[PDB]
Design a protein around this nucleic acid. Sequence first.
RNA 1: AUGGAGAGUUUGAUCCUGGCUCAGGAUGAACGCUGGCGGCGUGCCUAAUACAUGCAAGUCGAGCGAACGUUAGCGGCGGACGGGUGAGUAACACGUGGAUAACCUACCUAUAAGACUGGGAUAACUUCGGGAAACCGUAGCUAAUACCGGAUAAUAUAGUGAAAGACACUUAUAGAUGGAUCCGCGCUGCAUUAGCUAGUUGGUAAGGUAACGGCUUACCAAGGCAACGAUGCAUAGCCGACCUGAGAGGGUGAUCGGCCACACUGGAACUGAGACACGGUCCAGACUCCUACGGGAGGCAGCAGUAGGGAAUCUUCCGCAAUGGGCGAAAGCCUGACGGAGCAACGCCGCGUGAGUGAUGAAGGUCUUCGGAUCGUAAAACUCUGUUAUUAGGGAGAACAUAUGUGCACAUCUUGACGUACCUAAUCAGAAAGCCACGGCUAACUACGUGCCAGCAGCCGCGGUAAUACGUAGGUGGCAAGCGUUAUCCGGAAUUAUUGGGCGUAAAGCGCGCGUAGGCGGUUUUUUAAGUCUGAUGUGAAAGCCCACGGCUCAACCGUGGAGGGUCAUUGGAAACUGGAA
Lengths: 80, 78, 83, 136
Amino acid sequence: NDRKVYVGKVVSDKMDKTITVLVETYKTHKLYGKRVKYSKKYKTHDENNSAKLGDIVKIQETRPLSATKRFRLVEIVEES
Amino acid sequence: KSAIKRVKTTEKAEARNISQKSAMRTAVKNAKTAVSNNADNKNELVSLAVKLVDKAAQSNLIHSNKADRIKSQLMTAN
Amino acid sequence: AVKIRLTRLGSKRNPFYRIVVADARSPRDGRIIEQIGTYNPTSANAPEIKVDEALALKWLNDGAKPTDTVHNILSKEGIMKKF
Amino acid sequence: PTINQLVRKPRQSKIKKSDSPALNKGFNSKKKKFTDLNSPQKRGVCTRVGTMTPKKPNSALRKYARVRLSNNIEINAYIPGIGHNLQEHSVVLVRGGRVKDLPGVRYHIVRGALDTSGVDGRRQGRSLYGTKKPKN
RNA sequence: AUGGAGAGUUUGAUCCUGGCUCAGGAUGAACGCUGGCGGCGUGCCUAAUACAUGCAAGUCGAGCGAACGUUAGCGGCGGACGGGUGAGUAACACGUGGAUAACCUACCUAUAAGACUGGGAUAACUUCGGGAAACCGUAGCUAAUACCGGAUAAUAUAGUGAAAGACACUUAUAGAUGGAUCCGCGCUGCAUUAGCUAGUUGGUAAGGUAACGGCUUACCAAGGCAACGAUGCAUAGCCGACCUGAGAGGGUGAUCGGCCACACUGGAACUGAGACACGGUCCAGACUCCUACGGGAGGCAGCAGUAGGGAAUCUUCCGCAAUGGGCGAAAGCCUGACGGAGCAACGCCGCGUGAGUGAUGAAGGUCUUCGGAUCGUAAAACUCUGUUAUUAGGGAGAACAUAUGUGCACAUCUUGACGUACCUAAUCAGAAAGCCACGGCUAACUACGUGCCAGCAGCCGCGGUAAUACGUAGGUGGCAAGCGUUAUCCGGAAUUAUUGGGCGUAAAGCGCGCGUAGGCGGUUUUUUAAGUCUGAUGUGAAAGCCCACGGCUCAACCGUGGAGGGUCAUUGGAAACUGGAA
Ligand SMILES: [Mg+2]
Ligand SMILES: [Mg+2]
Ligand SMILES: [Mg+2]
Ligand SMILES: [Mg+2]
Ligand SMILES: [Mg+2]
Ligand SMILES: [Mg+2]
Ligand SMILES: [Mg+2]
Ligand SMILES: [Mg+2]
Ligand SMILES: [Mg+2]
Ligand SMILES: [Mg+2]
């Protein structure tokens, strides 16, 4: 039994751990069969790990501990 | 119409209970007061409150982790 | 709290029964934990005993109860004193 | 059209203009609101009778009424019959279906309906426009 | 492969786009005018409007306060589960799939164990007093598996429990059991709704909750959301399912199950493991009656009924025999949960109001030019039959223990509301009738009054004097205990076209540039593995549809094992094309 493992870029960051995580994904439309792409804006927290314009890093869901952030990982690979 | 017995059982029940719970909140009131008062109750008062949350804990009138938050809020202040 | 189902299935004017792990407060056709067989209560059946009780062996071996005077079908089985 | 402008503004079915538009709705007594019912028949009381003549390919002259239904949606309904009824302030039971060539009627009156049981001098119609005394 | 049809109508005629209307199935259906059967399923969908009236959860004293195996009141549980309706809710409420290094739980039954010492008090009881009663207090008691003090014991960083059979209660580890929160994806219409949000979005604390958290306050700050449709209004309880469809799709949500939300309307707590509680308390408000008017009462969205509004949906019914549901050791017990009869033709089917004969066969209807066909082998009047009617034995679901012999298990004695059913056996002719049409779509033709009148109408249309389209008559056609009509959905409709349409003149190309957001992309070599392809699992409950099987005199209807339960979940795996990078 494990956490989530989603990866993806960021938009920016502000003070106090506002590690928002943009995630892009594909889906079909339900009838016409076109491969439509769409995103989702997520949130997680850390110390000073990321910055604006490109901080693609995996996150992992945990107990909530916020009002919107429900991921506890900032494990970093690619950046600017 | 079985409730018309139950109208005055619970009245006697909490009518007894709120005094014991008020003495529970009063019995713990002087304890963390007393550790920051530099008083003579560095002993013999925290164990009184441990008797209060213990004797309250034996009844169902307070939940278990609540009493863990009194004990975890008092002996951990030592 | 866990019990054994004896519900009123089948065509009307012909009260049948299905045997399943039930609960004491959920109703007859209510939420079913797991199946425990059936029995032809039709009183016009020669071969009827339908309890493959290896999938019902966990019930009385983990805290069941007898059901509501179905005890003579509990008589034709024998699952007790094995422990 | 191509697919990208077809997953963007999708298909959108045709509207359904419905027959008997002056029906299906019950305006409430307490709450004083229109509703939706999809009801087969409704009551109503009558105001006029009259008869306008012209039906340009049909050319005879026939009568009509102005019933208004439960909670006052006034209407023009056509009376089937060689004879008629003799009642102002009726208790009709109206019926859908447009008698054509009269501009402004889409509704019938069922003969009988606890106000007038139709015409007495008709034998082999026997359910239309209110007859009786058959033992066929 | 067990899988799809069309017709009429624009003109003097023909093609072609385009509407319009039929032929099929449906139903929690009604209304007309005529009605006899049996086996089932189902009946305020408009007012979640108001309740005159009776009834829907009560049980128990071997623990202890009355008479001769009958009563209290303690208290022990139980009223948080059954049952009921859709008002609100476009939301993690539901449907699917996961997460608890965020968490809870007595009732049942594994263990590992205890009941030590007391003491004090109080209901009932009686007495007084006041109030048409209602509400109450005083006075003196006395209990009780009802309270409570100290004794020594895990689970906090050192800590508390026990009142019962004879010769039951409680303290921990557990299981199952029900919960609770969060997360990914899936959730109708309006752009003639484009700027929302201010504890609003983060941090540190302080608390508080079973549990983390902007859940609440103290500061610190700036955020967070959005053309991948935020906010706003309007409407709608969701789902496995049901109806339609060859399939793709489209339309529904009452039956019968899963899950919410709600109980005159609003709030907030109480006891309780568990409610912010349908048959509970407290507050404010609007209904509603009793009324010494002094204060005092209840909640039909539990069964039947009235008033209302309705197109319309009923017994002010009987019984626990069974099933489960509580309590009590155990009988017993309260149950409009449930089981049966009402009551309606409300669907679905299963039969039969007659039978072998019987010469044109008829008296009498119609056609008639009448010579003869027609109703019509119809009819008699012979010959034939019990289905309906007087009596009968009329006795399917119908079981399981508070015992004794053996060592909670076996055999052996204990329980029927509807009592019509199955039955057999004499044997009647008691109405299988009435609806609608008849010119073409689409099987069904002649006469009489009527003459653009009165009148039919799904559509084109029929009648201005001889209408097969009006109203009758006769005959014929389709029906079947009904027929037909109005109303809602799907197909026909490829008339919303992903399968499966078009834009010159028929409806349809922006007046034409430059352009961001988004959509699509030449040629080759490498690596990747998101889309792609594949297979090992966990899962999509059951009732229902699809075929097989047993049973109901076959049928309607029931039980058995399988498709088969979709986009998913985690790793194995292949790398031609689309991404992704050199
Ligand atoms: Mg023209
Ligand atoms: Mg009401
Ligand atoms: Mg209803
Ligand atoms: Mg009325
Ligand atoms: Mg016809
Ligand atoms: Mg006619
Ligand atoms: Mg076209
Ligand atoms: Mg250009
Ligand atoms: Mg570009
Ligand atoms: Mg397997």
